[PDB]
Amino acid sequence: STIEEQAKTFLDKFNHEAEDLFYQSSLASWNYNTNITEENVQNMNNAGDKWSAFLKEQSTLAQMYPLQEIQNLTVKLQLQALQQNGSSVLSEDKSKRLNTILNTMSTIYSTGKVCNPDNPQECLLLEPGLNEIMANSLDYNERLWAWESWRSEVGKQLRPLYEEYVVLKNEMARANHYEDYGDYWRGDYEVNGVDGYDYSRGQLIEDVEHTFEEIKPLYEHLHAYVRAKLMNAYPSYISPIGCLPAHLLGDMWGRFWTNLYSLTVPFGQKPNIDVTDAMVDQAWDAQRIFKEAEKFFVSVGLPNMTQGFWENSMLTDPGNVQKAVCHPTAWDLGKGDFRILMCTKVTMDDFLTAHHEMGHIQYDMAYAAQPFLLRNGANEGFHEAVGEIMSLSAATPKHLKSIGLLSPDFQEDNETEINFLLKQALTIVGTLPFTYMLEKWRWMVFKGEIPKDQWMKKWWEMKREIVGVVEPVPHDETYCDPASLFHVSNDYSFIRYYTRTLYQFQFQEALCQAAKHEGPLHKCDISNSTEAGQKLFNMLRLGKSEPWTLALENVVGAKNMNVRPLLNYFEPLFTWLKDQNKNSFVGWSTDWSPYA
Amino acid sequence: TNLCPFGEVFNATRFASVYAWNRKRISNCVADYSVLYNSASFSTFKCYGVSPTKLNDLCFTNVYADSFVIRGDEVRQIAPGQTGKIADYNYKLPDDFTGCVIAWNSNNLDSKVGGNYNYRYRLFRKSNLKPFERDISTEIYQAGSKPCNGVEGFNCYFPLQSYGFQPTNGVGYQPYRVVVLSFELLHAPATVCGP
Numbered sequence: 060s061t062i063e064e065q066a067k068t069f070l071d072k073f074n075h076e077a078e079d080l081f082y083q084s085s086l087a088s089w090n091y092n093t094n095i096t097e098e099n100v101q102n103m104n105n106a107g108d109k110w111s112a113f114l115k116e117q118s119t120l121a122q123m124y125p126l127q128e129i130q131n132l133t134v135k136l137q138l139q140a141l142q143q144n145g146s147s148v149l150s151e152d153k154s155k156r157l158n159t160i161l162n163t164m165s166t167i168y169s170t171g172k173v174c175n176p177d178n179p180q181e182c183l184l185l186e187p188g189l190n191e192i193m194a195n196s197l198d199y200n201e202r203l204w205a206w207e208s209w210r211s212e213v214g215k216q217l218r219p220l221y222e223e224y225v226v227l228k229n230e231m232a233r234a235n236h237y238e239d240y241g242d243y244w245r246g247d248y249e250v251n252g253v254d255g256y257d258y259s260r261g262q263l264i265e266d267v268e269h270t271f272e273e274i275k276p277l278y279e280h281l282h283a284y285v286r287a288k289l290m291n292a293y294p295s296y297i298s299p300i301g302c303l304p305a306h307l308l309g310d311m312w313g314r315f316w317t318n319l320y321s322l323t324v325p326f327g328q329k330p331n332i333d334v335t336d337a338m339v340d341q342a343w344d345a346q347r348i349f350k351e352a353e354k355f356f357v358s359v360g361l362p363n364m365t366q367g368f369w370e371n372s373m374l375t376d377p378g379n380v381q382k383a384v385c386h387p388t389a390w391d392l393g394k395g396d397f398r399i400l401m402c403t404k405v406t407m408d409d410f411l412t413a414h415h416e417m418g419h420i421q422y423d424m425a426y427a428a429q430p431f432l433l434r435n436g437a438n439e440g441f442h443e444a445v446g447e448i449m450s451l452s453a454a455t456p457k458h459l460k461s462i463g464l465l466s467p468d469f470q471e472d473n474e475t476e477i478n479f480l481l482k483q484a485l486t487i488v489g490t491l492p493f494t495y496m497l498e499k500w501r502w503m504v505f506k507g508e509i510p511k512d513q514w515m516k517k518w519w520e521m522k523r524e525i526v527g528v529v530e531p532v533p534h535d536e537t538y539c540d541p542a543s544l545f546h547v548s549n550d551y552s553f554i555r556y557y558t559r560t561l562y563q564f565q566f567q568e569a570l571c572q573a574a575k576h577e578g579p580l581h582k583c584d585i586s587n588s589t590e591a592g593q594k595l596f597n598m599l600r601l602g603k604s605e606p607w608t609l610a611l612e613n614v615v616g617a618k619n620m621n622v623r624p625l626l627n628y629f630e631p632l633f634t635w636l637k638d639q640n641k642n643s644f645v646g647w648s649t650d651w652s653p654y655a
Numbered sequence: 656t657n658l659c660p661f662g663e664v665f666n667a668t669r670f671a672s673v674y675a676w677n678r679k680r681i682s683n684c685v686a687d688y689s690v691l692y693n694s695a696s697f698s699t700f701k702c703y704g705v706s707p708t709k710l711n712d713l714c715f716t717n718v719y720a721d722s723f724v725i726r727g728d729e730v731r732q733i734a735p736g737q738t739g740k741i742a743d744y745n746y747k748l749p750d751d752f753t754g755c756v757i758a759w760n761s762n763n764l765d766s767k768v769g770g771n772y773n774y775r776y777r778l779f780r781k782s783n784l785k786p787f788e789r790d791i792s793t794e795i796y797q798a799g800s801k802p803c804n805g806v807e808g809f810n811c812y813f814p815l816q817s818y819g820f821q822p823t824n825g826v827g828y829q830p831y832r833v834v835v836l837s838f839e840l841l842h843a844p845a846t847v848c849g850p
């Protein structure tokens with residue numbers, strides 16, 4: 060008759076009722092995504108509203124069982140996951156305003172349009188026009204327009220809203236017994252009651268920072284090599300010791316440096332490995348693609364797809380009248396139903412994506428036997444890390460040759476090896492400072508460490524120092540440029556992209572060690588390696604039932620995040636970069652600014 | 656030449672919910688046990704004690720045929736000395752069970768788009784079921800320590816929950832029809848021989 064036992068029983072009833080109600084929502088929401096109709100837009104909402112109102116009904120009842128009296132740790136996790144007050148901890152009037160602000164900000168970004176000077180008729184949204192200019196154009200003055208105008212007509216609208224968004228979010232988190240809204244977000248990594256495997260909310264900032272310090276040498280060289288190569292492309296505009304002008308970095312917000320490859324390619328004449336032509340030559344269709352992905356997982360000891368997967372997934376655009384949201388997504392509807400929605404083409408980029416999305420399916424199947432509230436990646440970064448390591452293996456030359464898409468007469472020379480690692484460095488390494496700095500600005504804003512009259516002043520101080528990026532035009536405090544990015548003005552924690560990146564190379568290195576790969580981690584394939592599969596699977600099944608530190612330790616044997624695997628992955632590019640910048644300045648000066 | 660009416664059990668249009676499992680007493684007839692085991696229609700056919708291998712040779716006082724519907728993951732609980740919700744709260748076989756367990760997939764029949772909620776199960780009970788016991792009570796379970804007064808509320812749960820069977824569910828969440836044959840041997844005429 061203990062309070063624990065009551066909650067066990069309580070939780071037992073919850074799980075069985077929850078699975079069916081979740082299914083009805085998933086299936087209906089799967090209909091709208093596969094078959095857009097005003098009918099299903101309303102069907103999707105009706106199922107989601109009943110599922111939103113069931114969880115709010117169950118959250119209330121759960122709090123009647125106070126966690127202090129529960130000792131079984133797996134009971135306490137589920138109970139605690141259902142006892143989240145959330146915005147409800149606020150007055151209705153306030154919780155109704157916060158939702159108004161959030162929706163207002165989401166509306167301003169997604170509908171924010173910029174029109175031509177001297178031609179009000181001509182206008183461009185972020186997609187497709189503005190994003191094209193920033194990501195493909197090569198004119199300093201043109202780019203400055205798209206970069207600046209987006210932050211002046213969309214950012215300024217968001218500035219007063221973001222100030223009130225910070226007030227209310229901090230009130231909701233303090234009432235929920237968190238320090239500030241940032242401390243609340245850091246709770247996803249917290250672990251209590253497990254000797255030797257705990258983790259503090261604050262320890263993230265430490266381990267984020269302590270691991271970023273080890274990236275700086277690799278980023279500093281990548282930065283001085285990109286700056287050297289940009290200086291050849293706009294000579295009158297870039298300083299050989301200064302930060303990089305923000306608008307010149309391939310994104311409107313300067314997140315991923317990927318689109319700078321055309322300008323930074325180490326050996327331009329040698330082309331990249333594109334097996335797209337080979338796929339069309341052999342008449343592969345969408346079903347052959349996913350079939351080869353299935354064969355990959357099976358080759359490491361993981362189960363093949365359920366029949367319901369093949370019968371109920373949408374792997375080809377219906378097209379014609381039946382429109383559909385084509386973003387590749389992996390569905391875990393529950394009750395055994397696993398589906399992939401993907402408007403697959405016959406390209407190499409959608410071949411890898413088929414492995415990546417199926418990676419999520421494997422993670423979803425592996426922990427499906429766990430309770431309903433424990434079917435999720437160890438933390439916010441685990442799930443996306445599992446998905447990534449699949450297209451690491453699937454894209455190597457060693458793997459493409461073994462499935463008959465890459466000619467047996469192609470052999471890796473050290474020059475194509477560098478081209479690829481740069482493209483990877485521009486995307487993987489390039490985003491890490493941007494990501495750490497963007498979340499640090501927000502962590503501090505919420506903490507109170509940065510006053511309102513210095514939001515933008517402290518934003519661009521940290522862009523200069525941390526990211527090596529300088530604004531092309533001086534910015535007042537009427538601006539709110541951190542909110543010019545989706546994730547900030549749509550209220551999404553951003554540190555996951557940092558944590559998940561360090562996760563996937565820890566994963567990859569541990570698994571390739573089991574495969575006994577000989578050579579650089581760059582060309583490892585975990586194919587035909589059940590030992591790697593078992594080690595990964597030992598973590599997959601855990602879901603949220605075990606702390607993410609003990610989850611990580613099951614794969615890699617370390618209880619915490621380390622960037623060394625990432626560095627090992629790039630070491631041959633690190634030493635090649637350290638032989639391209641010998642007579643170049645590695646570093647940046649904070650003061651240099653293109654705006655005088 | 657009076658055949659045993661196995662058609663009424665196996666080909667019945669609707670089956671019972673496992674908590675109210677249905678028992679059909681077979682007697683004074685001829686049963687051709689080799690037709691079932693050698694029909695290749697069933698996903699499960701495990702016999703305990705007797706051998707399905709043409710042991711139709713033997714005579715038995717009474718043959719009982721228990722029929723219900725459960726989900727695919729739960730068929731393993733229809734076995735001696737297995738625990739779970741079904742084996743503790745719905746249908747318990749004894750430890751010295753001498754008979755067979757049969758089951759097949761019923762997704763074609765007992766699964767409906769949107770969900771077939773007509774099959775149920777007992778989710779809560781004060782104690783385990785004695786072998787071959789049948790409980791069809793609907794008394795509100797008291798999980799805490801305050802009388803429920805016959806209405807569900809806090810720590811008061813209606814003890815029967817509804818299988819939600821859908822055609823798109825996984826195999827383990829799909830419905831399965833189960834038939835358990837009990838062979839009784841008393842000091843009696845032994846009217847069921849079926850050579």
Ligand SMILES: *[C@@H]1O[C@H](CO)[C@@H](O[C@@H]2O[C@H](CO)[C@@H](O)[C@H](O)[C@H]2NC(C)=O)[C@H](O)[C@H]1NC(C)=O
Nearest residue numbers: 067130131132133134135428429430604738739
């Ligand atoms: C916490 O409670 C769960 C309740 O499920 C325990 O897990 C069960 O343990 C029994 C032991 O016989 C097994 O038969 C069940 O299969 C287990 N069920 C699940 C869902 O795993 C768990 O061991 C308890 N842990 C502690 C430390 O109290």
Ligand SMILES: *[C@@H]1O[C@H](CO[C@H]2O[C@@H](C)[C@@H](O)[C@@H](O)[C@@H]2O)[C@@H](O)[C@H](O)[C@H]1NC(C)=O
Nearest residue numbers: 660661662663664665666667690691694696
């Ligand atoms: C259940 O029916 C099966 C179908 O065969 C025929 O049986 C007839 C009685 C009638 O239902 C016809 O429509 C069917 O085509 C039969 O083969 C099985 O043997 C039956 N089950 C048993 C236990 O005999």
Ligand SMILES: *[C@@H]1O[C@H](CO)[C@@H](O)[C@H](O)[C@H]1NC(C)=O
Nearest residue numbers: 090093094095096098099381
């Ligand atoms: C799409 O939705 C419409 C309206 O509900 C429906 O008539 C049609 O059958 C659906 N298409 C599919 C996927 O069958």
Ligand SMILES: *[C@@H]1O[C@H](CO)[C@@H](O)[C@H](O)[C@H]1NC(C)=O
Nearest residue numbers: 122142143144147148234235
């Ligand atoms: C807020 O959460 C705490 C801990 O779960 C709980 O004690 C408190 O009652 C909650 N408040 C509301 C009104 O949700």
Ligand SMILES: *[C@@H]1O[C@H](CO)[C@@H](O)[C@H](O)[C@H]1NC(C)=O
Nearest residue numbers: 353357362363364365366369
């Ligand atoms: C998946 O494997 C099982 C055996 O483990 C087999 O029954 C099934 O047909 C396989 N599916 C495919 C598409 O190979």
Ligand SMILES: *[C@@H]1O[C@H](CO)[C@@H](O)[C@H](O)[C@H]1NC(C)=O
Nearest residue numbers: 358458460461462584586587
């Ligand atoms: C795995 O082993 C099989 C059988 O020996 C072989 O045909 C196949 O090519 C191997 N896989 C790879 C990745 O080459």
Ligand SMILES: [Zn+2]
Nearest residue numbers: 415416443446
């Ligand atoms: Zn993914």
